[PDB]
Design a protein around this nucleic acid. Structure first.
Ligand SMILES: [K+]
Ligand SMILES: [K+]
Ligand SMILES: [K+]
Ligand SMILES: [K+]
Ligand SMILES: [K+]
Ligand SMILES: [K+]
Ligand SMILES: [K+]
Ligand SMILES: [K+]
Ligand SMILES: [K+]
Ligand SMILES: [K+]
Ligand SMILES: [K+]
Ligand SMILES: [Mg+2]
Ligand SMILES: [Mg+2]
Ligand SMILES: [Mg+2]
Length: 1319
RNA sequence: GGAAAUUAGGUGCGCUUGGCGUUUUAGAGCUAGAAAUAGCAAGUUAAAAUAAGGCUAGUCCGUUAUCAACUUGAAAAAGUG
DNA sequence: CAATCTCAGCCAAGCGCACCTAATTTCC
DNA sequence: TGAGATTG
């Protein structure tokens, strides 16, 4: 008889075996190998430790990058093949010189000057074209016949770096405002604007923030204000999106953005509300935006050149040359003794480090700004710097804004210019344009041919896919359909039927009727509330749901029960405020087709379901139009144009065959039929498919993975999923240890940034239109502080008082929990606010008082509309106006502190339960031999603090094993004391439930001071009430737990793992004469070309062999640890001997090769242990088993901040000698197994320095000292403010004669190999 | 313990794309001096690589998951205290 | 040799599906 | 946190 306790974490699985007396057993286990030791005694408690499991995301991002480098290469190969025959007539080695440009001259097969193959022509090219954009601009505008090699380089540069695809359609640069002003002055003939003299080009295209440009433009318009209509429109032409609610005295918020796909719909929404006479105002705003859309990237007049992008880069180049000549002359004239640092020293962030060194543009500006401010004549240079427009390069981080249409424009222009002289450029013009513009649809995927586990594409024809034959060779329709269909759910009720689109008309009829059919109404005179009949439900649908997008309860009472039913008063149940379901698609299609009778005709049901299916399945508007033209004769061509733009996303939970297909046999009605009319029963969906008097249930019944696959497919972090599979393996081994007998119980407990924070605040403050970010700038790293993070999430205001907060007074403010943390265990931003004083929340019993909600609800709404607070947060802030926290609400919160509700933890329980319990009884009911109990961490956590079983994580890893043990003790004792709780904890009025769950753990204590201020007494022996079984002896059982937590022998096992992943560090270092760098390609010798550093060792191998020594190459026997790198692993494993001989080894003892992955364990002298960090470095392999009296002392001494704390404080004073006893424990342990006397001396020296410090502070910093003794990799630590650096063990020689220890997953089964016998 | 709907927030898997960086080479450095050097001039660009590579040869695949030892088995697996 | 210093690929866009948690209505 | 280089 025994039970198993388990603690499942992200990097550990604790485990323990207990008997019915809560003792941990011990056994003699056989010891295999070749050593003196035949057996060993081990306690049945320990913890498996492992490195974190990783998601597949990084692997995915690298797989994408590989495909894009491959495809970018093919774009160039496509272009070169087109140029191939004609280039062979101009220069038969031009493409060869390009391919070998990387090679040193000695390795080159052709002349070293790539473009022209001789130095005079090469020098002359760069003289005439200092940048490629000079050549691109020349080839666009000039009419001369150009060298075919220069044509290629210009086109290749555009194709290789082609710009983004975020803008759909065609772009044609062309650089109006006087017309829009004249337009507004017509639509508002009584209130005209005068824009005479307003330089609209300079004000709006200026570099500053758009909020400032808006102010600059409005400053030139007297009588107009920024939040006026015209002021709000200026943002629409600029690219922002303001709200026009107050401009038109609207009731609902309405915004507009030109770049969004819903602009024409939101404009139709606004124009249908304000009057079509305003169409010309948004029309002139859209006409102005076309000419000023590329003003950020096209800083050049478009009438002077057809290559404004390359012209803009030449502008960067020219201003760079002018300003560099200026800067040099200034420094030479004023600060001559700083010229060498600025323009020669690459190590400094001056111009030299900017051009030749590793200084970025941002680092160069920071270095040079104080130099400019100190000197005279740097007026314009300072302005360019603060505009981030000084001495700019052309290839820069901000070129991501360039759309591919801009590069396409110059590409097309060069082709038009030069096709007049080269016939092949005319015949391949559209082919070349296709190379630049073609983009593999994301709904097609990799263009594979049966060897990619990621691909789904199918081909119309079996031939190579090119950018020019893609539409003909690839079946886009079937591929796009497969893309979705391989991922969408099937109806769990009819597993062979696909679910409907979420926006299907039938699906929304189902949702509306399912909700409607359970509404009840009662009026004065009715005996009881009545359901709605079929005629009443149809009347409500036709009258309300088919005329309003949403249906409120007020509309139901006034527009149906009053007008139709002639009820003055009526009470409604089954719906609150408004109906949740609605016929959204019905009103979408009504506005598009403008034919209500068509929508209401049931004959058109199949057509409308296929239309919405097409709109949901496909995203490409042209594929949608293609799939819709079977119905083109049904609609006006203008309607079809709007129909193809109406796209939907998302799928429902049920199939069409379920909701309106299968029929009840006796009635002949489908499920939707019953929802529309079901006599006076009004059975809903759940009732219909569970009713034995209908045939839906039986038809759904007649329609109805390995362990690793099952766990892998679970939802949750792949980190926690690693511990789940390891937990199952730990349990399997423990059962085998206990003679294949299964346990009585298994108690499981499962443990519970700066980039996104800056984004939520930037997006939120922009939504509010606040200038808090300009008044108080921040960095993404500063928002890690929770008080400063709350300051910006609240726009610098108090959440409980309508007042500004002081950003320099955050230390005096309070961080209060919305729902008091005494009820719920939420310390996240969603349950915290920043207030001046927490007392202003109201009372501490409940949610913030009603008075606070009445004052701050509107302010909270603006934060909710800016995503600065979540809906769950807003609902918790405002819960007082809905009764606050009810007595039931308090009982649920305290219950959820005990009963684990996470789905992932239930899956672990289910997994263990279905593996332990496999038999069935006479009634074919499962026989639950093993009870799987789930506990929350707070249960054992409180048990530790209540009975002085304290935990200090930094001391060692034993706390994982102790946690699992206490889980088993508390779990079994709880189920023994209260067997009724098995429904809550075993897999398989309101005040009373609150008081019950509040005192569920009281049976452990002897004296209990409850909340009501009373003292209860319980006997030393707690028993179950029904049986006579004793469950807890408050004398001997606590002592048994104390003996367990003090046992020094705990099986801590670091899981040995082969290392996988990248071959090495990714940096390409410069060439060096070392043999440490790794070639980037087969023939790229790092002595000439540089290469990679630091290869990752996959595992090490023990090699007993001979190696040649000296010029004579005489053979000498060696025993060595050889690191097999990740890149080498496949070759080594394919033939180990040939691999080792290629490394220089001879006469390898083949059967003595031992594979030694990372963390392989070795024992040396005096119990000292080491783990392999690699082939050349070791990790610490021992655990410091600090006695329990010292662990409890450190906990109480470090946590100085009931009145019984005096008794705890007193115990600290009487045992102040424990501080020196702990230092001696650390010293003796370190002198035995750590062997870092330099650091240890600095430890003892730092400890003697701070013996005058308060005892709490000394106890806090002693906890840091255990970093020296911790298991695993050495790490730096500090004692008070003395930093002690790590001592690495960068030699593996000593383990070659030590004892190698192979451990099973629990560490109970050992094989020990004495390596000194090898050699 | 489940189901649908509504509202909101998270996570996973997969696909298609943009911009940098880095590396080697190309962009004639000049003058004085035997040289060491010194005084100047110059700098913004490009090519190519971006896991070595692989066979299945695709505009495909190559960094996740999973792994003590021993025995029998190539392998898969099973077994051993 | 040791003690000590030094270094580590990054930023961005769009799209699809499937899960999970947490409050609400209605049900099994 | 392994490992390359520099300093002692
Ligand atoms: K050569
Ligand atoms: K004004
Ligand atoms: K550089
Ligand atoms: K630089
Ligand atoms: K560059
Ligand atoms: K509602
Ligand atoms: K769609
Ligand atoms: K038509
Ligand atoms: K791995
Ligand atoms: K890893
Ligand atoms: K192991
Ligand atoms: Mg790229
Ligand atoms: Mg490649
Ligand atoms: Mg580049």
């Amino acid at each position: 008889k025994y039970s198993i306790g388990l603690a499942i974490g992200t990097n550990s699985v604790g485990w323990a075996v207990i008997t019915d007396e809560y003792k941990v057993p011990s056994k003699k286990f056989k010891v295999l190998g070749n050593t003196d030791r035949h057996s060993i005694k081990k306690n049945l408690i320990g913890a498996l430790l492992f490195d974190s499991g990783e998601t597949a995301e990084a692997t995915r991002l690298k797989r994408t990058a590989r495909r894009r480098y491959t495809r970018r290469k093919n774009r160039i190969l496509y272009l070169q093949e087109i140029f191939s025959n004609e280039m062979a007539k101009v220069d038969d080695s031009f493409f060869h010189r390009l391919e070998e440009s990387f090679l040193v001259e000695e390795d080159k097969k052709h002349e070293r000057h790539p473009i022209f193959g001789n130095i005079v022509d090469e020098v002359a090219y760069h003289e005439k074209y200092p940048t490629i954009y000079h050549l691109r601009k020349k080839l666009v505008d000039s009419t001369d016949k150009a060298d075919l090699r220069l044509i290629y380089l210009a086109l290749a540069h555009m194709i290789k770096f082609r710009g983004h695809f975020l803008i759909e359609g065609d772009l044609n640069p062309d650089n109006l405002f006087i017309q829009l002003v004249q337009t507004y002055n017509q639509l508002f003939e009584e209130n005209p604007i005068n824009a005479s003299g307003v330089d609209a080009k300079a004000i709006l295209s200026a570099r500053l923030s758009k909020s400032r440009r808006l102010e600059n433009l409005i400053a030139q318009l007297p009588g107009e204000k920024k939040n006026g209509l015209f002021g709000n429109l200026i943002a629409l032409s600029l690219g922002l999106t303001p709200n026009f609610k107050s401009n038109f005295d609207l009731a609902e918020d309405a915004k507009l953005q030109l770049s969004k796909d819903t602009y024409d719909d939101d404009l139709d929404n606004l124009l249908a509300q304000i009057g079509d006479q305003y169409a010309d105002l948004f029309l002139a705003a859209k006409n102005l935006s076309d000419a000023i859309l590329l003003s950020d990237i096209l800083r050049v007049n478009t009438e002077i050149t057809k290559a404004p992008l390359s012209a803009s880069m030449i502008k960067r180049y020219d201003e760079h040359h002018q300003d560099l000549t200026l800067l040099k002359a200034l420094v030479r004239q004023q600060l001559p003794e700083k010229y060498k640092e600025i323009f020669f020293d690459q190590s400094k962030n001056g111009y030299a480090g900017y051009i030749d060194g590793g200084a970025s543009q941002e680092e160069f500006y920071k270095f040079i700004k104080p130099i400019l401010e100190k000197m005279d004549g740097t007026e314009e240079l300072l302005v360019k710097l603060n505009r981030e427009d000084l001495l700019r390069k052309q290839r820069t981080f901000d070129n991501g804004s360039i759309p591919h249409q801009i590069h396409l424009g110059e590409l097309h222009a060069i082709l038009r210019r030069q096709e007049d002289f080269y016939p092949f450029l005319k015949d391949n013009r559209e082919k070349i344009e296709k190379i630049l513009t073609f983009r593999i649809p994301y709904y097609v995927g990799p263009l594979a041919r049966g060897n990619s586990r990621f691909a789904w594409m199918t081909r119309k024809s079996e031939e190579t896919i090119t950018p020019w034959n893609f539409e003909e060779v690839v079946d886009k329709g079937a591929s796009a359909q497969s893309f979705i269909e391989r991922m969408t759910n099937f109806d769990k009720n009819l597993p062979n039927e696909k679910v409907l689109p979420k926006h299907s008309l039938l699906y929304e009829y189902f949702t509306v009727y399912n909700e409607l059919t359970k509404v009840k109404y009662v009026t004065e005179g009715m005996r009881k509330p009545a359901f709605l009949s079929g005629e009443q439900k149809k009347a409500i649908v036709d009258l309300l749901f088919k005329t309003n997008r949403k249906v409120t309860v007020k509309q139901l009472k006034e527009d149906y029960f009053k007008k139709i039913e002639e009820f003055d008063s009526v009470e409604i149940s089954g719906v609150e405020d408004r109906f949740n379901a609605s016929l959204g698609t019905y009103h979408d299609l009504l506005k598009i087709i403008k034919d209500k009778d068509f929508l209401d005709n049931e004959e058109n049901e199949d057509i409308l379901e296929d239309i919405v299916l097409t709109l949901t399945l496909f995203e490409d508007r042209e594929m949608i139009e293609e799939r819709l033209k079977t119905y083109a004769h049904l609609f006006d061509d203008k309607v079809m144009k709007q129909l193809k733009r109406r796209r939907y996303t998302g799928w429902g939970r049920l199939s069409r065959k379920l909701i309106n297909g299968i029929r009840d046999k006796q009635s002949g009605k489908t499920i939707l039929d019953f929802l529309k009319s079901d006599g006076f029963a009004n059975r809903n969906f759940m009732q219909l498919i569970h009713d034995d008097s209908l045939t839906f249930k039986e038809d759904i019944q007649k329609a109805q993975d390995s362990l690793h696959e099952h766990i892998a497919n679970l939802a949750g972090s792949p980190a926690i999923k690693k511990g789940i599979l390891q937990t199952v393996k730990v349990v399997d081994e423990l059962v085998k240890v206990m003679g294949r007998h299964k346990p009585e119980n298994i108690v499981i407990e499962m443990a519970r940034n700066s980039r996104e924070r800056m984004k939520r605040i930037e997006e939120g403050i922009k939504e509010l239109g606040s200038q808090i970010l300009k008044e108080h700038p921040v960095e993404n790293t500063q928002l890690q502080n929770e008080k400063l993070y709350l300051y910006y999430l609240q726009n610098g205001r108090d959440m409980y008082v309508d007042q500004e907060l002081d950003i320099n007074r955050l230390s005096d403010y309070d961080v209060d929990a919305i729902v008091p943390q005494s009820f719920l265990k939420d310390d996240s931003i969603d349950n915290k606010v920043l207030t001046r004083s927490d007392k202003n929340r109201g009372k501490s019993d409940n949610v913030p008082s009603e008075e606070v909600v009445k004052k701050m609800k509107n302010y909270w709404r603006q934060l909710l509309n800016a995503k600065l607070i979540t809906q769950r947060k807003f609902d918790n802030l405002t819960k007082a106006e809905r009764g606050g926290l009810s007595e039931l609400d308090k009982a649920g919160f305290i219950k959820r502190q005990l009963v684990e509700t996470r789905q992932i933890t239930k899956h672990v329980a289910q997994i263990l339960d279905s593996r332990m319990n496999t038999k069935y009884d006479e009634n074919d009911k499962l026989i639950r031999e093993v009870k799987v109990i789930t506990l929350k961490s707070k249960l054992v956590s409180d048990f530790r603090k209540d009975f002085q079983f304290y935990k200090v994580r930094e001391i060692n890893n034993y706390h994982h094993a102790h946690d699992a043990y206490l889980n088993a003790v508390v779990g079994t004792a709880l189920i023994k004391k209260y067997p009724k709780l098995e429904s809550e904890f075993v897999y398989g009025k309101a005040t009373a439930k609150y008081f019950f769950y509040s005192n569920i753990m009281n049976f452990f204590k002897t004296e209990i001071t409850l909340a009501n201020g009373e003292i209860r007494k319980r006997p030393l022996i707690e028993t179950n009430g029904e049986t006579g079984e004793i469950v807890w002896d408050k004398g001997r059982d606590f002592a048994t737990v104390r003996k367990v937590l003090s046992m020094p022998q705990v099986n801590i096992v670091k899981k040995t793992e082969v290392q996988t992943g990248g071959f090495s560090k990714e940096s390409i270092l410069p060439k060096r004469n070392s043999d440490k760098l790794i070639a980037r390609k087969k023939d790229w010798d790092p002595k000439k070309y540089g290469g990679f550093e630091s290869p990752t060792v996959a595992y090490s191998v023990l090699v007993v062999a001979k190696v040649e020594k000296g010029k004579s190459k005489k053979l000498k026997s060696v025993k060595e640890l050889l690191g097999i790198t990740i890149m080498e692993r496949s070759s080594f494993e394919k033939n180990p001997i040939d691999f080792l001989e290629a490394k220089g080894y001879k006469e390898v003892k083949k059967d003595l090769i031992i594979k030694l992955p990372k963390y392989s364990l070795f024992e040396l002298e005096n119990g000292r242990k080491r783990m392999l960090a690699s082939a050349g470095e070791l990790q610490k392999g021992n655990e410091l088993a600090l006695p329990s009296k010292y662990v409890n002392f450190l906990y109480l001494a470090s946590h100085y901040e009931p009145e019984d704390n005096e008794q705890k404080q007193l115990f600290v004073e009487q045992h102040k000698h424990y501080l020196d006893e702990i230092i001696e424990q650390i010293s003796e342990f370190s002198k035995r197994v750590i062997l870092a006397d330099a650091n240890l001396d600095k430890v003892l020296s730092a400890y003697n320095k701070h013996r005058d410090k308060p005892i709490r502070e000394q106890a806090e910093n002693i906890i840091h000292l255990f970093t020296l003794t911790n298991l695993g990799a050495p790490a730096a630590f500090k004692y008070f403010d003395t930093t002690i650096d790590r001592k690495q063990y960068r030699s593996t020689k000593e383990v070659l004669d030590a004892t190698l220890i192979h451990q099973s997953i629990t560490g109970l089964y050992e094989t020990r190999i004495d390596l000194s016998q090898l050699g």
